[PDB]
């Protein structure tokens, strides 16, 4: 009756017939809606000479998976779980203007899964991106670096 057995039962039920290579939509015509947001942890560096910007960010992503659903009443009122993100399908968000870094998220932390199918995933990432630097008014300059 302890929450641990209930969670183990839920895990065995969820990943019995789960394919992580498959877009998680009931209908082929359905579109996966990914809520995307950034959270800047710090501005590590602005490299004027190399025209590169290093940031530390949290990449907040949220979507729905129609296979990772359950009724909490049948699992001791478990409403949400944490699972490794490498066990489920994820969107392939990459930074186009990468420079001297990674295109994709490499940390792969755990994902928060709710009983209605909602998946919340917020891995950290350090990005080095390109941005043209204007030094007309240096050292009173205002730069505009994009991602």
């Amino acid at each position: 009756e302890t929450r641990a057995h209930a969670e183990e039962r839920l895990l065995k039920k969820l990943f019995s017939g789960y394919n992580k290579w498959s877009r998680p939509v009931a209908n082929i015509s359905d579109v996966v809606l990914v809520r995307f947001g950034l959270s800047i942890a710090q501005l590590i560096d602005v490299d004027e000479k190399n025209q590169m910007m290093t940031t530390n960010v949290w990449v907040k992503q949220e979507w729905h998976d129609y296979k990772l659903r359950w009724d909490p009443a049948d699992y001791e009122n478990v409403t949400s779980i944490r699972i490794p993100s490498e066990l489920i399908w994820r969107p392939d968000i990459v930074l186009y203007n990468n420079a001297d870094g990674d295109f994709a998220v490499t940390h792969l932390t755990k994902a928060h899964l709710f009983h209605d199918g909602r998946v919340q995933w917020t891995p950290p990432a350090i990005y080095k991106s390109s941005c043209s630097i204007d030094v007309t008014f240096f050292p009173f300059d205002q730069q505009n670096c994009t991602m």
Partner: protein
């Protein structure tokens, strides 16, 4: 640093007399539940510990983990009194998987 961590896992208990009076064993930390405690104010984006050492488990379910780590944390540098300056550099440790509702952090 060594990030000393301690918690109880009730599922890792045993009766010593049934196992030749063994009082503790070493289990690979990769094979047991770990609290994902890391340094948030790191610079260079390194969060985890360096090696993921073994964990010492006691017969009563207590876990003692002592992994090494190389950390590059960022701190405000005060230059007012350089080169007679003293710096105040902090290191913030958090669980990136679990919030206060699931685990509590306590200073030994």
């Amino acid at each position: 640093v060594w990030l000393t961590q301690e918690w109880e896992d009730y599922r890792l208990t045993w009766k010593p007399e049934e196992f030749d009076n063994m009082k503790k064993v070493r289990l690979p930390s990769k094979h047991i539940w770990l609290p994902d405690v890391v340094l948030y104010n790191n610079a260079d984006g390194m969060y985890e510990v360096s090696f993921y050492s073994n964990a010492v488990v006691s017969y009563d379910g207590s876990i003692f983990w002592l992994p090494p780590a190389i950390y590059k944390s960022a701190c405000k540098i005060e230059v007012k009194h350089f080169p007679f300056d003293q710096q105040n550099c902090t290191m913030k440790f958090r669980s990136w998987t679990y919030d206060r509702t699931e685990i509590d952090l306590v200073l030994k």
